[PDB]
Amino acid sequence: SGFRKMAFPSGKVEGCMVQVTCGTTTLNGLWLDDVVYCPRHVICTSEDMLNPNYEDLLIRKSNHNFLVQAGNVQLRVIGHSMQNCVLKLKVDTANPKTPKYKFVRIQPGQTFSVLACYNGSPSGVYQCAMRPNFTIKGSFLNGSCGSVGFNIDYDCVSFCYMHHMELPTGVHAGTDLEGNFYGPFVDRQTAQAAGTDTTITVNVLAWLYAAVINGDRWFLNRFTTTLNDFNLVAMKYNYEPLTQDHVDILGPLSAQTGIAVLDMCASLKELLQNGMNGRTILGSALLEDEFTPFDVVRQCSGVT
Amino acid sequence: SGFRKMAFPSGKVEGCMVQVTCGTTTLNGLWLDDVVYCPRHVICTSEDMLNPNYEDLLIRKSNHNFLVQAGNVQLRVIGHSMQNCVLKLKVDTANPKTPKYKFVRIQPGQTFSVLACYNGSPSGVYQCAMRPNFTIKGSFLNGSCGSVGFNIDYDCVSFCYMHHMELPTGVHAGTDLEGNFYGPFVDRQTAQAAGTDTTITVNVLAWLYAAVINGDRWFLNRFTTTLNDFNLVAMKYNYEPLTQDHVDILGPLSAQTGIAVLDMCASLKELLQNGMNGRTILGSALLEDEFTPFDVVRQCSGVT
Ligand SMILES: *[C@](O)(C(=O)NC)[C@H](C[C@@H]1CCNC1=O)NC(=O)[C@H](CC1CC1)n1cccc(NC(=O)Nc2ccccc2)c1=O
Numbered sequence: 176s177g178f179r180k181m182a183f184p185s186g187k188v189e190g191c192m193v194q195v196t197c198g199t200t201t202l203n204g205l206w207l208d209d210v211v212y213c214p215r216h217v218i219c220t221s222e223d224m225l226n227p228n229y230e231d232l233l234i235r236k237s238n239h240n241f242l243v244q245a246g247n248v249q250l251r252v253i254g255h256s257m258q259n260c261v262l263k264l265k266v267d268t269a270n271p272k273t274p275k276y277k278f279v280r281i282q283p284g285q286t287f288s289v290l291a292c293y294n295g296s297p298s299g300v301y302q303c304a305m306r307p308n309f310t311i312k313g314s315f316l317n318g319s320c321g322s323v324g325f326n327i328d329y330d331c332v333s334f335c336y337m338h339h340m341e342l343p344t345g346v347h348a349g350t351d352l353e354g355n356f357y358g359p360f361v362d363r364q365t366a367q368a369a370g371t372d373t374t375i376t377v378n379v380l381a382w383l384y385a386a387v388i389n390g391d392r393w394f395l396n397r398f399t400t401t402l403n404d405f406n407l408v409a410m411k412y413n414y415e416p417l418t419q420d421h422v423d424i425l426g427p428l429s430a431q432t433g434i435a436v437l438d439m440c441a442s443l444k445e446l447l448q449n450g451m452n453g454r455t456i457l458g459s460a461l462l463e464d465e466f467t468p469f470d471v472v473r474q475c476s477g478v479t
Numbered sequence: 480s481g482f483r484k485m486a487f488p489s490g491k492v493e494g495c496m497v498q499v500t501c502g503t504t505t506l507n508g509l510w511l512d513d514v515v516y517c518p519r520h521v522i523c524t525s526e527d528m529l530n531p532n533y534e535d536l537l538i539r540k541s542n543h544n545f546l547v548q549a550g551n552v553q554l555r556v557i558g559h560s561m562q563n564c565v566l567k568l569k570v571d572t573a574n575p576k577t578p579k580y581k582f583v584r585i586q587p588g589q590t591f592s593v594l595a596c597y598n599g600s601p602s603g604v605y606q607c608a609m610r611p612n613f614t615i616k617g618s619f620l621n622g623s624c625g626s627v628g629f630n631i632d633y634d635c636v637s638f639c640y641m642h643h644m645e646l647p648t649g650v651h652a653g654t655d656l657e658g659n660f661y662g663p664f665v666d667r668q669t670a671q672a673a674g675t676d677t678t679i680t681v682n683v684l685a686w687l688y689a690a691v692i693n694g695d696r697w698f699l700n701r702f703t704t705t706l707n708d709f710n711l712v713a714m715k716y717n718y719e720p721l722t723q724d725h726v727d728i729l730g731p732l733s734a735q736t737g738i739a740v741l742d743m744c745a746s747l748k749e750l751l752q753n754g755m756n757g758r759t760i761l762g763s764a765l766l767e768d769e770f771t772p773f774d775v776v777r778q779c780s781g782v783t
């Protein structure tokens with residue numbers, strides 16, 4: 176049994192990761208078929224970062240300015256296109272190991288695997304969630320940019336994130352693979368703080384269900400509640416408003432544990448109102464909100 | 480910046496994972512060159528599990544009893560050998576994608592990546608530590624057995640663990656790739672509980688150093704201490720005795736933060752004696768002991 180923060184295998188993505196060099200700047204690229212994707216700020220100097228005009232910066236740039244390196248192989252750029260905040264570089268080769276793939280923009284609450292890369296080479300993989308504020312709590316050093324976040328349907332890799340910037344609080348922002356930022360952020364060295372970081376209620380309820388499954392159950396109260404009731408408690412503790420689909424979604428888990436959603440909503444309610452009082456649910460001494468109902472099911476089923 | 484529990488890329492290991500079927504039982508195998516490694520309890524029936532005599536069970540078994548499946552390919556077994564609690568199956572093919580590899584037995588405190596597998600296909604990867612008791616806190620369902628834990632030196636994969644059983648408390652035990660159990664455990668369905676789970680002191684000190692680096696510093700006290708002093712506090716809170724090498728090892732971190740080891744030993748000392756009082760160091764409301772000094776450095780350097 177047992178339960179951990181666990182990421183999708185990285186093998187399929189690994190072999191799509193290449194180094195991109197334009198001038199001084201060097202960051203990571205995603206190579207699918209004969210296109211290579213990268214953050215457009217690869218063309219920016221440090222003096223530009225303050226206030227860049229990417230179109231204008233693009234004038235002076237040509238195919239030959241972009242050094243794309245796949246291990247020890249210098250892919251020939253033969254065409255370059257900007258899309259929102261991504262650069263796409265047409266190359267003369269197709270990636271032999273392009274998998275079945277897709278670009279998806281995820282909703283806030285949804286989780287993905289992040290393969291961290293420095294110089295086209297992967298350092299590590301870790302799982303995180305798209306937070307309500309639209310930020311992520313990543314692990315990212317200078318060089319990391321152009322790393323991507325993904326899910327797999329054991330066949331088709333789904334690309335949701337590409338990393339661009341770090342923010343106050345030491346959190347992160349980035350783009351879908353069409354280069355639109357999650358959240359009202361821009362690629363610019365300017366003051367742009369995050370909003371209020373709210374907790375993903377449904378995700379916690381899943382974590383609590385995962386505890387029951389596993390055996391931790393001390394938090395299980397004898398009371399029930401209402402949706403309206405609980406949502407009136409939730410806003411006080413900056414949790415996200417729990418809806419009916421959210422209820423629907425927790426059904427299978429409810430099914431498996433024989434604990435109605437709304438009873439679990441009341442177990443949580445007291446934990447908000449009374450804290451864990453220095454006990455540990457599933458190892459954590461905090462309420463974990465970075466597991467989707469699906470993420471739990473994956474792990475309490477053995478899906479591959 | 481930011482800091483996460485992060486696992487080595489799984490790509491190289493992924494392509495060494497195969498399904499092994501002997502009778503009803505079906506578990507995972509590691510295929511390197513022309514040998515396939517699996518837990519020997521693949522030859523056990525449920526009636527055997529109670530008390531198995533593997534030698535005796537082996538008599539009735541032949542090369543043709545072991546179905547090794549690499550995706551949709553039925554590797555020909557041509558020789559079978561038992562080593563402690565592992566089965567090695569000689570096959571007529573070499574694994575095309577065998578990486579530079581090694582078998583290492585790790586010490587308690589050392590961490591590795593676990594690639595969880597069901598039916599030769601990987602479900603997920605996650606990082607955990609070999610605990611002082613010699614157990615691991617894994618995520619493992621029936622089917623998981625024969626999954627392996629590894630580190631990579633970005634070249635050479637080092638194999639340290641292969642998963643066999645789950646224990647009371649919902650923790651796990653297993654073997655090096657030579658099939659010797661970590662800890663005084665046997666492959667048998669019998670009563671065999673773990674010992675006292677102690678905390679890996681040095682690992683926590685690293686986590687604390689990772690906080691300072693990142694920016695969390697509220698726990699930094701104005702006091703210092705002694706090794707003997709702190710170790711007298713540690714035993715009370717079931718932490719591992721901190722030694723001089725452990726001090727030596729924390730040097731680079733000390734170097735980077737300009738905080739002597741022994742000052743950090745005093746910051747910890749109060750946290751033991753006073754608890755976090757419902758604050759969060761690096762997201763966790765608990766003292767995290769599953770990061771090696773090296774693990775921190777990797778992540779606060781960008782090693783690949
Ligand atoms: C990325 O460009 C890269 O890897 N390039 C090789 C880089 C990655 C980040 C740096 C360290 N960790 C990271 O995730 N990101 C940037 O340098 C980024 C460039 C974007 C396009 C404009 N960037 C530039 C300038 C400033 C910041 N962030 C801050 O300094 N913000 C901040 C202000 C106050 C307090 C805390 C943070 C930035 O991310």
Ligand SMILES: *[C@](O)(C(=O)NC)[C@H](C[C@@H]1CCNC1=O)NC(=O)[C@H](CC1CC1)n1cccc(NC(=O)Nc2ccccc2)c1=O
Pocket residue numbers: 176504505506520528619620621622623624625643644645646647648649651665666667668669
């Ligand atoms: C493994 O054999 C497998 O995957 N086979 C296909 C399997 C994996 C575990 C089952 C669920 N999670 C796991 O990690 N392990 C076993 O079945 C294992 C076999 C070993 C060789 C003897 N095994 C058999 C019998 C009993 C246990 N453990 C317990 O039931 N122990 C226990 C007692 C009391 C309280 C809690 C646990 C066992 O692991």
